[PDB]
């Protein structure tokens, strides 16, 4: 892996930013690998999370947020267009009202902001992947 | 322009980071346009500058740094492989001992760190360009 995992990246996010994550699952899909992305409001892992994203490859995605230290109401989708054993490109685009999640160019979900995305100061990419690159673009 | 100019981007830089700047000069080369990139240590424009970069299109590049508010010894190169009127790609790659400057895939200079690049908290892109995109990658 080009970058260590858990990869904790300090970020500054604004409307129009894109977080592009490129990596490869480290286990085949029959082994139920996961990929987790957390939009943290501080480098401390107990800080609030504006957007939590856990892909269960070949299964579903679970999304949530943590406010005043409390996990809020979980959201899910079954649209998991990741391919077994291949590199993926995961793009999280910050619109004025939501994070748009695109997997390999395919939009799968729009997670609405309950706090402004400019409150995000760290993005952590974790779990069962090898990372080739992470870019924050505007 | 997709992004306003002067564009002041909060950043976090580490060894292995790449700053990729894509834009177009807003004047023809006979009009002596410039492109300036400042690696600032804080959002305040009077803060120290780890790496200052001013392209005089069709002419030369001037580089310097500002320490304790004082401009240090200026460095220059004549290698300015920008094309008149075209979009450029300016990549600044942070190695352990230097910033590598690549213009349109062409390495033109290596500006050695006199403070650690992790001290850079803001990158400002300014002067005679229209910006299509700025990405910070690892």
Numbering used by the authors:
A (entry chain A), B (entry chain A): 2 to 139
Quote the paper.
Aside from R53H, the double mutant R53HR55N also could co-crystallize with Tris, but not lactose. The Tris molecule in R53HR55N occupies a different position compared with Tris in R53H. It seems that Arg55 plays a role in stabilizing Tris in R53H. In contrast, Asn55 could not stabilize Tris, and its hydroxyl group points up in direction. Here, we found two Gal-13 variants (R53H and R53HR55N) that could co-crystallize with Tris, that also has three hydroxyl groups and shows a triangular shape when bound in the ligand binding site.
Galectin (Gal) is a lectin that binds to β-galactosides. Because the primary and tertiary structures of Gal-13 are highly conserved among all galectins, it had been named galectin-13.
